Design an enzyme around this catalytic site. Structure first.
Site, mmCIF file in Angstrom:
data_model
loop_
_atom_site.group_PDB
_atom_site.id
_atom_site.type_symbol
_atom_site.label_atom_id
_atom_site.label_comp_id
_atom_site.label_asym_id
_atom_site.label_seq_id
_atom_site.Cartn_x
_atom_site.Cartn_y
_atom_site.Cartn_z
ATOM 1 N N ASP A 92 35.797 44.559 13.982
ATOM 2 C CA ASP A 92 35.524 45.909 13.514
ATOM 3 C C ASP A 92 36.352 46.111 12.256
ATOM 4 O O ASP A 92 37.104 45.223 11.832
ATOM 5 C CB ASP A 92 35.788 46.912 14.622
ATOM 6 C CG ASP A 92 37.209 46.911 15.145
ATOM 7 O OD1 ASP A 92 38.132 46.467 14.408
ATOM 8 O OD2 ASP A 92 37.342 47.388 16.300
ATOM 9 N N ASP A 266 29.201 46.529 22.468
ATOM 10 C CA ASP A 266 30.569 46.210 22.822
ATOM 11 C C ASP A 266 31.097 47.432 23.558
ATOM 12 O O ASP A 266 30.686 48.554 23.215
ATOM 13 C CB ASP A 266 31.509 45.960 21.654
ATOM 14 C CG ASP A 266 31.921 47.240 20.959
ATOM 15 O OD1 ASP A 266 31.121 47.742 20.128
ATOM 16 O OD2 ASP A 266 33.026 47.786 21.188
ATOM 17 N N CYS A 304 25.886 38.973 42.735
ATOM 18 C CA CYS A 304 26.623 38.352 41.638
ATOM 19 C C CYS A 304 27.009 36.890 41.865
ATOM 20 O O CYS A 304 27.590 36.533 42.889
ATOM 21 C CB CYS A 304 27.899 39.135 41.371
ATOM 22 S SG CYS A 304 28.843 38.591 39.930
ATOM 23 N N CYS A 306 29.149 35.219 39.949
ATOM 24 C CA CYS A 306 30.456 34.852 39.382
ATOM 25 C C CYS A 306 31.372 34.191 40.414
ATOM 26 O O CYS A 306 31.218 34.273 41.609
ATOM 27 C CB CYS A 306 31.110 36.039 38.679
ATOM 28 S SG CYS A 306 32.210 37.053 39.704
ATOM 29 N N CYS A 309 33.082 36.423 43.022
ATOM 30 C CA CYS A 309 32.253 36.784 44.173
ATOM 31 C C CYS A 309 31.948 35.565 45.019
ATOM 32 O O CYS A 309 31.589 35.747 46.194
ATOM 33 C CB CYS A 309 30.967 37.470 43.696
ATOM 34 S SG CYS A 309 31.298 39.097 42.978
ATOM 35 N N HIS A 335 34.918 39.401 37.049
ATOM 36 C CA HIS A 335 33.691 39.892 37.701
ATOM 37 C C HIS A 335 32.944 40.853 36.808
ATOM 38 O O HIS A 335 31.741 40.693 36.576
ATOM 39 C CB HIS A 335 33.998 40.540 39.075
ATOM 40 C CG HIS A 335 32.784 41.311 39.517
ATOM 41 N ND1 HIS A 335 31.631 40.738 39.993
ATOM 42 C CD2 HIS A 335 32.565 42.643 39.526
ATOM 43 C CE1 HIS A 335 30.761 41.698 40.267
ATOM 44 N NE2 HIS A 335 31.289 42.880 39.994
#
Ligand SMILES: [Zn+2]
Ligand SMILES: [Zn+2]
EC number: 2.4.2.29
Lengths: 369, 369
Positions: A92, A266, A304, A306, A309, A335
């Protein structure tokens, strides 16, 4: 790969799915960018960020210029080498955080001077710092407009931002190494006013950028208003370039934004709020600190994929967050960023398959049940 | 594998190298055990702890009984399943932390009652809690002796500890599931007095344990004194069982302790001090916060094979720790625990090769140069 190539592979309504090719890698769109404040995505190693599916991260110029310093980072080899992320980085301009976090600021047509939470930023200095960091996607330096804003104030700040847009363009192009290897995005301003948004789009398109951000819509507007303004604002931007909604946001905001033509996002919500106990699930968010999770053996989210999880229970993560343990922040953050990436993957696949409208309806009906 | 089998494969002087076989895995000796306070090795996933070379971790009963609760952990499947570490776990008895961290304590021959920083511990309750956690190596519950201590006080607390040793033995053996699958260690006390250390060793050997800890030598003694007491104390213990020095310590303390016959170690130094900025290197420790590291591109240690030293610079870790970033704690901790494991590996290989005396001399000459 080229310096920059955005290609749209599939459309549904105003929604688009496609790719940005850059020297450091391909960015799948619609894209979610985890936020790296001070050269780290909080509580995650870069390999972990990549493992969640992220193609690109955001770096905050303001924070980096304060600590460790732009020139220092350049001396050390650039931001990518410094933090160990070798894929694209969007930086940014630092202008927002000047206004929300710094003190004793002094604004003028040349730029802004301010005290660290003494420094300076201007279109030229901001583009220079992004260069020193080694940014792949550079954001034009502008002047934010608070919400609400009067039409006169909104117009003055938009006008100044467009003058600074041209200055940003020129500073970028004068630096051949930057111009040949990075991309430059311009930011549409105009608060919530259609005429000002149109004037801003026209000014940016006239100058010409690699991508176009919608700025100023995450500073207090609620969703209905944000969507109302996106409804007329996004079509004003060049169709064949990426559309970046800065600072947004919640899963439902993303879905609706993509319905309105946004390609990039974002937000610090997944990382920040995860450190604070909020876990995203397909059935809506939960606060893992709630006593109801103390003996819940289920994973944070039932579907999920991931790593978190796969291996740990709600009960365990509940314990860690209540105890203030760093592993709790680590696991919550992994997560939530993985959730966000799975959301973007579902969005891309559904647009590719011409079933995104159905996906948005189904998503909502369950997320808000 | 058996419940418990300690085998000595090689010796040099008083030093030993070998293995403890247990149902959940093999422990290479001499061993360093990373400390998991409240069901986490601070700032590391269990896979990362394993990646550093750790064969076993320590769990602090005191903290676990307070949060999240022993019975809760048992209901949830035990400590290993709860935190995701499936290899051996040694649990302390909780007695030390009662004395150093709890309030309004009330000690008696039955045990101790105390207030959380209202609870109870006794030989029976401590062994029970370790059972509820699913501990592989259980520590007898005893009564600590401060340093310095008068001979009368040292003897009284040692005597009580040996009575409690027998109570611990009996509680463990009466619980068939525990007796058949876990091991029980007894703790030698006696402060710094040879006669009391001998009485304690004899009492423990008479009762009979799977391993023998040297307790009470990490509560203010300096190294010379600690080594002096180890010189006569460790030979008093059964040779054919493991020798565990609780609460020790610094790399040079470990080396000298192994020279005196110690087989197992735990300490919060690598984890705690790493969070605080101290990095271990073969040339001695450094404090990464020192400004001299701000543009140092070298890894934390020039020879260390850990992932941290493969990928990040001193400059970067310096920045993270100064900024209070969680990744800084994560990376410092991973490095320091990997350092400690490489130390133990060098110690084991040198004893196996009959060159440990040389290794200790070389280690010291460089670590203290
Ligand atoms: Zn997950
Ligand atoms: Zn290392």
């Amino acid at each position: 790969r080229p310096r920059f190539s955005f290609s749209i592979a599939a459309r549904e309504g105003k929604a688009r799915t496609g790719t940005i090719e850059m020297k450091r890698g391909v960015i799948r769109t619609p894209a979610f960018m985890p936020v790296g404040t001070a050269a780290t995505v909080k509580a995650l190693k870069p390999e972990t960020v990549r493992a969640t599916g992220a193609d690109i991260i955001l770096g905050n110029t303001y924070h980096l210029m304060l600590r460790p310093g732009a020139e220092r980072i350049a001396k050390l080899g650039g931001l990518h080498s410094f933090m160990g992320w070798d894929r694209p980085i969007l930086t940014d301009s630092g202008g927002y955080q000047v206004m929300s976090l710094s003190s004793l600021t002094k604004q003028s047509e040349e730029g802004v001077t301010f005290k660290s939470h003494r420094h300076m930023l201007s279109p030229e200095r901001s583009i220079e710092i992004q260069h020193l960091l080694g940014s792949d996607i550079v954001m034009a330096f502008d002047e934010c407009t608070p919400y609400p804003a009067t039409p006169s104030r909104a117009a003055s700040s938009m006008e100044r931002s467009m003058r600074w847009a041209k200055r940003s363009r020129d500073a970028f192009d004068s630096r051949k190494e930057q111009a040949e290897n990075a991309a430059l995005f311009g930011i549409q301003q105009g608060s919530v006013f259609e005429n000002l948004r149109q004037q801003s789009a026209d000014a940016l398109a006239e100058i010409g950028f690699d991508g176009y951000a919608v700025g100023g819509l995450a500073v207090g507007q609620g969703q209905d208003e944000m969507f109302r303004v996106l409804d007329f604002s996004v079509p004003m931007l060049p169709d064949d370039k990426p559309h970046y909604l800065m600072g947004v946001g919640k899963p439902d905001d993303i879905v609706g934004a993509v319905e309105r033509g946004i390609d990039m996002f974002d937000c610090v919500l997944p990382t920040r709020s995860g450190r604070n106990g909020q876990a995203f699930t397909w059935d809506g968010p939960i606060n893992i600190r709630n006593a109801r999770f103390s003996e819940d053996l289920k994973p944070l989210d039932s579907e999920c994929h991931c790593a978190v999880c796969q291996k740990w229970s709600r009960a365990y993560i509940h314990h860690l967050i209540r105890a203030g343990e760093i592993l709790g922040a680590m696991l919550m953050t992994e997560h939530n960023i993985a959730f966000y990436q799975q959301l973007m993957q579902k969005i891309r696949d559904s647009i590719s398959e011409g079933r995104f409208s159905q996906f948005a309806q189904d998503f909502r009906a369950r997320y808000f049940a």
